[PDB]
Amino acid sequence: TYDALRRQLIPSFDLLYGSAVSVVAMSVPATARILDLGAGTGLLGAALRERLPDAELLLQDRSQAMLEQARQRFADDDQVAIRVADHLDELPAGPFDAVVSALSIHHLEHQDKQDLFTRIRKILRPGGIFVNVEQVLAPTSELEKMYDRQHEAHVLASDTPAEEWAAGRERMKHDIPIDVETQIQWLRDAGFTTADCLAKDWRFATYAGWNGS
Ligand SMILES: Nc1ncnc2c1ncn2[C@@H]1O[C@H](CSCC[C@H](N)C(=O)O)[C@@H](O)[C@H]1O
Ligand SMILES: [Ca+2]
């Protein structure tokens, strides 16, 4: 039900989450240590586990209530740990082969995003990857209205319950998105040697930075 509702709310869920899993699987070994930042109920971690059965996953979030759903999702998994931490709290020591995030970093002020990308690179192995499945802003107000129409079109086409879309619109008041190319440049500023947008559906995009590749 929860997972079904995320697909109803998020355009191109399989393309965007799938692209995150694929780019990690082509960038790190089977036995990678992976941090999922703002893991929530652990959906991105779960997508990674399906492809990488031997990866060690650390799921981190500020919300014990969200992480309880992740604990249930990963009940029988001996290679998953859970950590309660804000993005602005001290990160785990690492090192990590990959740091991944979905629909979380857009909650931070822009300066805190720029600092976070830098802090993430410091806990990555050389050649390590940062991947974000993210809600992004259009480059202009007029395009932002078109992004909004395309998002609403997916939500309506998916037969999303009206109450859940209303609750979605209210949660989105707290969002601090920026355009995808600005955030990709922030990865270059943080010292990532390569950064790219792998996949995009208007308001939603999967992008990555490599720490030396
Ligand atoms: N500053 C912050 N530090 C840590 N987690 C944060 C945060 N701001 C928001 N979050 C978390 O970010 C998540 C956004 S919802 C996305 C959850 C999950 N990554 C998924 O793809 O389904 C929530 O679990 C919320 O608690
Ligand atoms: Ca949000």
Author numbering: 17 to 229
What does the paper say about this structure?
Here, we characterize the O-methyltransferases BelI and CysG, which catalyze the initial step of β-lactone formation. Employing techniques such as crystallography, computational analysis, mutagenesis, and activity assays, we identified a His-His-Asp (HHD) motif in the active sites of the two enzymes, which is crucial for binding a catalytically active calcium ion. As expected, BelI as well as CysGΔN16 adopt the class I methyltransferase Rossmann fold, characterized by a core domain of a seven-stranded β-sheet flanked by α-helices. The HHD-motif enables regiospecific C1-carboxy group methylation of their respective malic substrates.
